[PDB]
Write a protein that binds this ligand. Sequence first.
Ligand SMILES: O=C[C@H](O)[C@@H](O)[C@H](O)[C@H](O)COP(=O)(O)O
Ligand SMILES: O=C[C@H](O)[C@@H](O)[C@H](O)[C@H](O)COP(=O)(O)O
Ligand SMILES: O=C[C@H](O)[C@@H](O)[C@H](O)[C@H](O)COP(=O)(O)O
Ligand SMILES: O=P(O)(O)OC[C@H]1O[C@H](O)[C@H](O)[C@@H](O)[C@@H]1O
Ligand SMILES: O=P(O)(O)OC[C@H]1O[C@H](O)[C@H](O)[C@@H](O)[C@@H]1O
Ligand SMILES: O=P(O)(O)OC[C@H]1O[C@H](O)[C@H](O)[C@@H](O)[C@@H]1O
Ligand SMILES: N[C@@H](CCC(=O)O)C(=O)O
Ligand SMILES: N[C@@H](CCC(=O)O)C(=O)O
Ligand SMILES: N[C@@H](CCC(=O)O)C(=O)O
Lengths: 608, 608, 608
Amino acid sequence: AGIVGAIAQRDVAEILLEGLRRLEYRGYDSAGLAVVDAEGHMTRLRRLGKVQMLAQAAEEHPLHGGTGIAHTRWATHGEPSEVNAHPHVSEHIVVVHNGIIENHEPLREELKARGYTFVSETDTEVIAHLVNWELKQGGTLREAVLRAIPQLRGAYGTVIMDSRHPDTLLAARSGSPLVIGLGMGENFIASDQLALLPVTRRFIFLEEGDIAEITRRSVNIFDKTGAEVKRQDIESNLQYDAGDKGIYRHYMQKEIYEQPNAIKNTLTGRISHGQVDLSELGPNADELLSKVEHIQILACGTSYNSGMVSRYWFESLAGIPCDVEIASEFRYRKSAVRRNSLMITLSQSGETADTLAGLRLSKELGYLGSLAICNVPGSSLVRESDLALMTNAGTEIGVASTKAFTTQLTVLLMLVAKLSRLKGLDASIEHDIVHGLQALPSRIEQMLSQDKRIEALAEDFSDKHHALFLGRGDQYPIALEGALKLKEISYIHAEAYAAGELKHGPLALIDADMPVIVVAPNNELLEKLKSNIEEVRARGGQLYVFADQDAGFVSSDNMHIIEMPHVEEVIAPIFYTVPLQLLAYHVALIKGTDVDQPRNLAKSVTVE
Amino acid sequence: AGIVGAIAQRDVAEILLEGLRRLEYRGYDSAGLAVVDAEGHMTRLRRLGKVQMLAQAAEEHPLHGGTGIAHTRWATHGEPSEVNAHPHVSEHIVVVHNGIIENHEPLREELKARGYTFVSETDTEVIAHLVNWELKQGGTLREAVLRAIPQLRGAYGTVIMDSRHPDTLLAARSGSPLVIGLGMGENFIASDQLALLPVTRRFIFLEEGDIAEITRRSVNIFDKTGAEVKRQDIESNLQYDAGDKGIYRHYMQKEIYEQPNAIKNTLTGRISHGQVDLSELGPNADELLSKVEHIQILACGTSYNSGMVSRYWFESLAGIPCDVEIASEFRYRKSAVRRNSLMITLSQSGETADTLAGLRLSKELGYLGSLAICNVPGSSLVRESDLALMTNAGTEIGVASTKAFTTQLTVLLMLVAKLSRLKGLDASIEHDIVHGLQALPSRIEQMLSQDKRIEALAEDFSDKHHALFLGRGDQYPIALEGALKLKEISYIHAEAYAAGELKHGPLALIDADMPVIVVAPNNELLEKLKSNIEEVRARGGQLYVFADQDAGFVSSDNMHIIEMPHVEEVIAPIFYTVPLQLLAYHVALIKGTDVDQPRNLAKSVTVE
Amino acid sequence: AGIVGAIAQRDVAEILLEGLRRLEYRGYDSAGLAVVDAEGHMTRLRRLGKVQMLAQAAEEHPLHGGTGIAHTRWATHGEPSEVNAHPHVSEHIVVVHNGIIENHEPLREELKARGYTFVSETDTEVIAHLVNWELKQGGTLREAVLRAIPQLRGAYGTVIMDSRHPDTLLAARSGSPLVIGLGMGENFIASDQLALLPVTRRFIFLEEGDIAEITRRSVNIFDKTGAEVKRQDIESNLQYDAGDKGIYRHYMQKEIYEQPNAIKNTLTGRISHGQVDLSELGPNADELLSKVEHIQILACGTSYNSGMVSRYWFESLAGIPCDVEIASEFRYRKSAVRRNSLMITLSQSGETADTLAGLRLSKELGYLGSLAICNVPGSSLVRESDLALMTNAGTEIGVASTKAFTTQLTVLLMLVAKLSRLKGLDASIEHDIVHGLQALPSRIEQMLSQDKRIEALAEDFSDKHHALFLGRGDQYPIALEGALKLKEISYIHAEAYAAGELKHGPLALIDADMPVIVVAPNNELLEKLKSNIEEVRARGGQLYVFADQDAGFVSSDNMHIIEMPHVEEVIAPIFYTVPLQLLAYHVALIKGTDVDQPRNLAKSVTVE
Ligand SMILES: O=C[C@H](O)[C@@H](O)[C@H](O)[C@H](O)COP(=O)(O)O
Ligand SMILES: O=C[C@H](O)[C@@H](O)[C@H](O)[C@H](O)COP(=O)(O)O
Ligand SMILES: O=C[C@H](O)[C@@H](O)[C@H](O)[C@H](O)COP(=O)(O)O
Ligand SMILES: O=P(O)(O)OC[C@H]1O[C@H](O)[C@H](O)[C@@H](O)[C@@H]1O
Ligand SMILES: O=P(O)(O)OC[C@H]1O[C@H](O)[C@H](O)[C@@H](O)[C@@H]1O
Ligand SMILES: O=P(O)(O)OC[C@H]1O[C@H](O)[C@H](O)[C@@H](O)[C@@H]1O
Ligand SMILES: N[C@@H](CCC(=O)O)C(=O)O
Ligand SMILES: N[C@@H](CCC(=O)O)C(=O)O
Ligand SMILES: N[C@@H](CCC(=O)O)C(=O)O
């Protein structure tokens, strides 16, 4: 379940154990480690149970040495026991293993008929004995492993050492992940980079098939053949940019105006022959998804707002039950899991602590599985989910989310077709969805071209300290987002409310210092809201209405129609986000606030 | 439940009984009284059941004496029984008591060790034995009482007499009301002046912490230190001919303060044999309920807030899926009904147009059936639902709802047991809920007893135009309701947020004109939030924390701990509603806003 | 200039050298390191020139040992030479130091008299002997250090080890940054976190006045009184590889903190043998400059402010007439040129239209010639002038100028020696100037170390809409620039005035909404201003005073002294600029305004 390896000048056992602690979120039923001093004395220590047991034993009888491998196990072959736990040995050959060697018994009898005593049930032990064999005939660890790897079928990863030669480790990625961590005169490796953070941030991710020879001072990478490939050491990931601001003053402004392009990119590879094509999920996929009867979405901030929009879509268009929840609230409560529930997480950054906690928790609760909708490749939410859909918006530098939100919405709309319930309705539905998606980039462009009007409109808000945003249905979460945006970058106390709840409280607040915005109401809703604002005429209440030019609404003295171009219904919520983004942007511009880095806010909330 | 005491020249039994009769609106399961003659002969009579039984018993066997005390009991510790009814005795010490001694176990032990025999199951008996013990070492009843008080935890509201010295009563106002009634050559005391109207109209209201020593011809009041305190004696005009708000300035005030009795009425006939009893729903329905797999709740405003708490309850305590939605949102969208779904509506008035439309719409979407939780008999939601549970709160006249909310909560919590889907126990869950509910009224009185404190706190808010209310889990909808209340009757732009989401937007708004309130956080949460408010120290950000005194939280200069009495966790959400109602009320008083009829709001919104 | 320290199981020499490598971007002229093995054998290497030389020298040595310290030097006291490099020793005491011990002569004489031999010209060496002396009396290294710190006056970030006991390091911060890196069973320290990145991301920043005792496994921090103080370790969730802001939140912030190094770059190659070396100007430079009888300076904005400082310098220290004028005023009027007049333009960008026009016009007016002080090579102003001096501050991205201003001041101060006319009567003028210039970089760092206090002070201006900045003589243009900065990035209406003119008008304006700031006044001036603010106590007039702590100024209730460390008089105006820059920056942070791109301002005004 977890692998860790170190080759250093200092004692590495403490580091190995700490690595395993940090791998506890996965696995596991047993654990163990094996280290080696300079004289070649290998000390091995294994327990059935928690890592804490192993650390306990390790404490009162310390392991000394600068070379070592450690492992946490989730048994697949052989009952959980100290006997079957890793590392496994073949005399001087020591091995840790993740995944499965599929052809175990063939090779095990092959080697058994060669003098090898299999003391365990695991498929792993075969690895050890085989490496032993191949080393029997000259060469050293590398050549040998290079021969042995092809003789193992299966998705797996393994780290291998010879205690007669502590200066080298060998690794093999063949269906299960491994990453190397670069230290100073020492080097590490693990099944996930989470394990190496205490000790390094320089990583070399192995490619599928790669084989690595690691020393204190060197790291050589090859493939199945043995031909020295080179791999680069990433760290991040979220670089900026300059520069890439182009004709725009601010990262956030740029990110607003690139939304058509970002959406095009989100659509790329996912539309064909007038249908939604999510085949990128896998050959299976279309079959895990078929079993889903309920959707649970978890997110924070703006991502929560996108989830909130998607609920309306899933329930009305696809006919699937869908719940959306603040991740903080999910992780801290005992919940009731619905039958056949898909867990979806929404996250720009993929690192938000609350949302990650929610996903991990979901794993113990009996969810069908998880899908991450995310904007940053190789992030934690992505690595830890069963399925992932990247938004492809490009890096987003402004602290307030803009393109990340509209691309999230795009992907969520794409899921609707691929998850319908509710068949027969039906092709009319996926049809309308795809037509809308095809229209979307241009509709956004239309909307961006209203910027001068929105920029003029912002003068009505730049001296305000309160605002109320109203919305109904698939537009309520758009009002939420518009309010959040005004909070974020202009510091105005803007609050969103469901349109039908105005009379139940907020109406008592409305006056000249608290403008009311409604997002895309139909005529019936508007009549109701006009009547409401008439109730507070004597205090100078103003209604602002972003609405379809086709609707024919007529401005009055206390109600200002801000007409917009027509849109396909199915994408209207995405469309109507843009003006609210532009409004917040232009208010901030007038006030002179720090748009890209608003006070007290962070791009990503990753620590607790 | 009800206390009456008397000290006169004439016989007082008839007066004490008439007092009890006049206190009957406070739910009770039993009653008793004790009187002493000039010679020191003490007579006590106690009966299970109605005051009528007690009076009748007293008639065959007339009680002589000018000194006496009297009590109706609402059982919290020890079943209703003659054995457990008050007054309780420790030889010459005779005591009546309202409320809950938090440390009765340890005290009962220490007193048993000193040789006292406990004949009842009540916490109350420890008071009598403890006073008897402190009196052992000589002194005045007063000094003994003063010694006893510090060793007591919780609400020890009490009236005490020593049958050897019938010339004095001792009273301690702790946890519920006590009013002194001044006669001519006689004095009286009761938990409400209604009890005393037959004999006087001059009253002195006792405050939390006051201790009174009373004789026929004098009244001396002091705190636990001994220091005299002055309290003014007001004369009562009126009788109760006013459209009675009685002693209260506003209907909303009355309705906040009658919450204990309202709740008692909500429980009538619904607890039997230590279990929840909803047999009123009929045998036919207890069957339907076994079939429910999912709960759906529709409501508007404050009713929506109570539904929102219940979500957390049903999911964690009953392990059933529960969803809660604004009625207008549900009616105007096409939804996906869950398998075997119960439709629940919450509504004070039963006529709210959105909620009613929601019920009607649901009639054709395939729910198992509908249940209405309501406060108005005969109303639309009650007639059109399959089942109905009335809150029995009495009429609510204030436009903002208070007792309707807490009675709604009381019903919802009772529904938990009868809709349980967990296994094992489940049994202890229903026991905890039942004990919680039996304690709830006393708990509310303890909160009401904090009103002066809350009234001082209101000064920090009276001139604000913004506020942010935070809560996590089952306290988050309590923050919703707190904020709504401040909006409603004080016109302050108060907004509620999930505690976990503060860093995701609202933190950017916080400064001196926008105080932050947290409802009932644990230490981990308080730490996160404390760090947050540190982030906006430079802008004069203030954090106000309502929390359990037992938590041992400590104030700093920008974080203010408003400690509260300890309460059972299952009813903490109800309990913590009260200080938020009191806050809004007192802010409104300072500003002089129209509490009972806030601008632009209506009792119910019955028109489309 | 740079400090690194390590205490580990493994050898730390390579780690030390790599740290220094990562500190190299900071101006240095030499480097050294010293490491101690477990047997207490101490190996020390020092070399003149780049870190590369040090690393080579290390190539020959088996530098074993787990404890050590290392340093890059920027000489202030004693020529750059291997003899003068750090670490400096006193037998078993080994010491690295950033900053300036200015009571170094008293201490060196006292220690010489006590039997110590000073083998170097540095101020640093007295620390090594002093600690040595203090350990001679006994106690632990920590106690000796506590006794020694108080005897030091000035700036010191120092790390200190005893080769006889290599398991402990001591560090003290006062006027120069230190930060601790926490590892796995090893610990580290550095003057700059960038040096610790290869081995850890967990830091504890030492604050002003702190003293730390570091072992492999412990960190204990405390103040000069031995009183343990606590600091929070925090994971560094920073992306160091993200873009050009490096570790900073804002370009302007980075440009403020970069000021010491920018200044070192301005000084590079312009001090030779204790004298200003402007030979870069050409062989026949002194030829033109000798003829100059009068200086005319033209500039806009902040550049005009530096010019304005220089006027005082030129006239008082070089005794040449100097005139400074807003460029647009000069270009549009018919002026009367002085005889043998040198035309100097100051400009960060070299492209400002008014300034450029000024120069061009001067071409036809009979000036001896033109000198351009500029920060961008190849700019119009540089190309079109006879002589040019570049400030070498590196690119400046912030719209408001910071390092451009202080580097300009540095160049202008160097011109003073090369343009002298006091005969004299001189010699010591140039010596003083060169001394101040040598100290400048660490003096600026000393100011930066006061940032926490300036941050705190900012709360006092965060909500103000007016301010008045006062200065006299060479501090008056500093007030000009402080006031400009506050206008620029916080949008507060701040205005500077000559101190002596306060009573001639602005005094009428003063009240609580308009704080008064004085920069670096002497006692006589201070008393005048104190009386002035008295006149307006009744309207809430506050006087904030930035002054030398050596002056012994005492705060009243409406006069607030903000003490600053002593500095060389001749560079006092550059010194006092920093706190006004930091003030404006922190006010903008609190208000959340666009620091890097303030509303309506441009980096340079190039169009007519
Ligand atoms: O008013 C506070 C309550 O005590 C509340 O905190 C609840 O009892 C626990 O938080 C349990 O939550 P879960 O059982 O859902 O985890
Ligand atoms: O943004 C506006 C949309 O057009 C929105 O109004 C939605 O498409 C309809 O409300 C349909 O939803 P239902 O099918 O659930 O009624
Ligand atoms: O009040 C305005 C004056 O007319 C003033 O503008 C001045 O007389 C001219 O501008 C000429 O000045 P110069 O001769 O210096 O260009
Ligand atoms: O979407 P995530 O990366 O999970 O972050 C959720 C939220 O985090 C922070 O608050 C950002 O400032 C927001 O803009 C974002 O919406
Ligand atoms: O509870 P209901 O009768 O369904 O009414 C819902 C809401 O309507 C109005 O706004 C009242 O002022 C509220 O106090 C109430 O909560
Ligand atoms: O120094 P210069 O390039 O000639 O520019 C003069 C002024 O121009 C602009 O106003 C910049 O914002 C200033 O910071 C600068 O001082
Ligand atoms: N199949 C191997 C490895 C399991 C794992 O990857 O944890 C075993 O059971 O030992
Ligand atoms: N707790 C006490 C008092 C009850 C009451 O306040 O009525 C009892 O159970 O007897
Ligand atoms: N003043 C000391 C230290 C200089 C520095 O901070 O680099 C010296 O001249 O060596």
